Amino acid sequence: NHNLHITEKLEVLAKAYSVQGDKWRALGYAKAINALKSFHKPVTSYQEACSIPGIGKRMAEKIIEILESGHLRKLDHISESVPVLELFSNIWGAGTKTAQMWYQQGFRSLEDIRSQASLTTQQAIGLKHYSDFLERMPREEATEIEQTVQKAAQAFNSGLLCVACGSYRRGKATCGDVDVLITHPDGRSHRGIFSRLLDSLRQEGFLTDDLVKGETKYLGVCRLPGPGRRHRRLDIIVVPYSEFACALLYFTGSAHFNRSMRALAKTKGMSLSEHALSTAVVRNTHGPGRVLPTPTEKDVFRLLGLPYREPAERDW
DNA sequence: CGGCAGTACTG
DNA sequence: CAGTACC
DNA sequence: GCCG
Ligand SMILES: [Mn+2]
Ligand SMILES: [Mn+2]
Ligand code: NA
Ligand code: NA
Ligand code: NA
Numbered sequence: 001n002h003n004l005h006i007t008e009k010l011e012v013l014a015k016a017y018s019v020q021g022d023k024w025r026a027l028g029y030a031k032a033i034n035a036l037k038s039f040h041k042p043v044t045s046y047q048e049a050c051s052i053p054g055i056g057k058r059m060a061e062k063i064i065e066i067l068e069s070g071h072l073r074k075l076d077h078i079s080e081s082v083p084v085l086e087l088f089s090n091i092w093g094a095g096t097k098t099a100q101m102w103y104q105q106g107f108r109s110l111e112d113i114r115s116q117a118s119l120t121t122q123q124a125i126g127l128k129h130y131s132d133f134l135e136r137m138p139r140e141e142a143t144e145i146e147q148t149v150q151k152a153a154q155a156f157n158s159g160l161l162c163v164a165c166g167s168y169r170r171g172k173a174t175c176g177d178v179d180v181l182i183t184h185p186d187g188r189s190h191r192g193i194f195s196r197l198l199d200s201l202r203q204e205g206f207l208t209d210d211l212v213k214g215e216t217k218y219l220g221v222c223r224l225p226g227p228g229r230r231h232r233r234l235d236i237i238v239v240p241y242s243e244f245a246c247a248l249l250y251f252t253g254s255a256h257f258n259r260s261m262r263a264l265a266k267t268k269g270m271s272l273s274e275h276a277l278s279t280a281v282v283r284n285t286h287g288p289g290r291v292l293p294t295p296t297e298k299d300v301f302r303l304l305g306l307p308y309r310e311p312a313e314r315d316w
Numbered sequence: 317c318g319g320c321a322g323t324a325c326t327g
Numbered sequence: 328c329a330g331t332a333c334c
Numbered sequence: 335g336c337c338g
Contacts (some may be wrong), residue, residue: 199336253334
């Protein structure tokens with residue numbers, strides 16, 4: 001990164017915009033920040049600024065002020081509330097709206113929130129694991145977690161396939177959570193197993209808390225046996241074999257890579273979701289189309305006219 | 317001017 | 328529904 | 335915030 005002396009200061013505004021709710025401006029900043037990391041050279045000019053895709057006028061001027069100032073003006077006028085809003089929004093299940101309300105009501109610290117704030121079932125679980133959910137795990141621990149789920153699932157029907165996705169499948173050394181995907185070749189044996197599997201994982205204490213118990217998506221908390229173990233976020237998604245490849249790619253990410261893929265699909269009258277790549281094409285103000293067969297991840301890249309990127313290179 | 321994704325819970 | 332979360 |  002040739003521009004850490006520029007990105008460091010923009011990351012402060014970005015996070016300030018996101019916690020304050022300005023989600024589009026925050027996105028715009030984020031793009032620009034990743035662009036300058038991607039760049040090969042230090043930015044040297046206002047026109048070298050506008051040259052980058054993702055850097056426009058307004059942020060060209062800010063890099064311009066920084067490149068002489070050595071520091072930016074706007075940073076001195078950040079509202080005093082940003083650090084508190086960030087602290088609150090880092091509770092799982094609490095977003096920008098809940099944090100700003102808590103701030104309006106005078107809350108200023110997690111002791112205040114524990115003391116006086118009403119919390120949803122999800123937020124109380126998030127607060128209780130506030131530190132654990134902020135730290136990443138070694139990828140080897142992600143492997144035990146996948147294997148724990150896999151042996152539980154394969155006991156019922158051994159035809160079942162189980163794959164950890166997310167940053168783990170992208171080959172990163174540490175993982176924020178574990179995203180386990182499940183399907184069955186016979187195309188029907190995948191259905192109605194959350195009953196038995198989550199009961200089995202809950203049997204000897206692997207599952208500790210449930211955040212979301214949908215019919216296809218489970219989000220929750222797990223912990224491995226023995227000393228030194230922290231509580232880890234675990235998600236489980238069960239899909240029809242038809243949608244295996246598309247789910248495989250969505251839940252491996254990354255989120256910016258998924259977003260770029262969706263954008264290119266839109267250039268070609270197609271739509272990409274976790275369920276399917278579709279020729280749903282009508283776009284003139286904003287009637288779906290046809291799901292195209294994608295037995296493998298390769299097919300999605302292919303029908304989109306891209307060369308196959310293996311998971312490790314989608315870590316955008 | 318207006319999209320930047322869609323989908324699934326929760327209450 | 329608004330809010331939040333998943334990548 | 336950017337960009338068409
Ligand atoms: Mn993940
Ligand atoms: Mn813990
Ligand atoms: Na540009
Ligand atoms: Na949160
Ligand atoms: Na996850």
